[PDB]
Amino acid sequence: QPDHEGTYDY
């Protein structure tokens, strides 16, 4: 996904 200056999944 879009990265929101520190998100992640898969």
PDB file of N, CA and C in Angstrom:
ATOM      1  N   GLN A   1       0.777  -1.282   0.000  1.00  0.00           N
ATOM      2  CA  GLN A   1       0.000   0.000   0.000  1.00  0.00           C
ATOM      3  C   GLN A   1       0.830   1.368   0.000  1.00  0.00           C
ATOM      4  N   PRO A   2       0.086   2.505  -0.044  1.00  0.00           N
ATOM      5  CA  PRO A   2       0.496   3.790   0.459  1.00  0.00           C
ATOM      6  C   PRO A   2       1.065   3.728   1.884  1.00  0.00           C
ATOM      7  N   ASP A   3       2.038   4.581   2.209  1.00  0.00           N
ATOM      8  CA  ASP A   3       3.268   4.178   3.014  1.00  0.00           C
ATOM      9  C   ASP A   3       3.249   4.891   4.390  1.00  0.00           C
ATOM     10  N   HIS A   4       2.413   5.929   4.486  1.00  0.00           N
ATOM     11  CA  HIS A   4       2.070   6.838   5.525  1.00  0.00           C
ATOM     12  C   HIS A   4       3.292   7.260   6.463  1.00  0.00           C
ATOM     13  N   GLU A   5       4.494   7.276   5.899  1.00  0.00           N
ATOM     14  CA  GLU A   5       5.766   7.573   6.576  1.00  0.00           C
ATOM     15  C   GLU A   5       6.014   6.597   7.791  1.00  0.00           C
ATOM     16  N   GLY A   6       5.521   5.370   7.641  1.00  0.00           N
ATOM     17  CA  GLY A   6       5.937   4.210   8.449  1.00  0.00           C
ATOM     18  C   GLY A   6       4.915   3.109   8.612  1.00  0.00           C
ATOM     19  N   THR A   7       3.994   2.876   7.660  1.00  0.00           N
ATOM     20  CA  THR A   7       3.157   1.710   7.723  1.00  0.00           C
ATOM     21  C   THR A   7       3.733   0.652   6.869  1.00  0.00           C
ATOM     22  N   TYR A   8       3.383  -0.627   7.090  1.00  0.00           N
ATOM     23  CA  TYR A   8       3.583  -1.830   6.249  1.00  0.00           C
ATOM     24  C   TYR A   8       2.499  -2.874   6.520  1.00  0.00           C
ATOM     25  N   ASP A   9       2.038  -3.601   5.499  1.00  0.00           N
ATOM     26  CA  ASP A   9       1.626  -5.019   5.592  1.00  0.00           C
ATOM     27  C   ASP A   9       1.972  -5.611   4.185  1.00  0.00           C
ATOM     28  N   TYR A  10       2.458  -6.845   4.126  1.00  0.00           N
ATOM     29  CA  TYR A  10       2.546  -7.739   2.963  1.00  0.00           C
ATOM     30  C   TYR A  10       2.866  -6.984   1.627  1.00  0.00           C
TER      31      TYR A  10
END
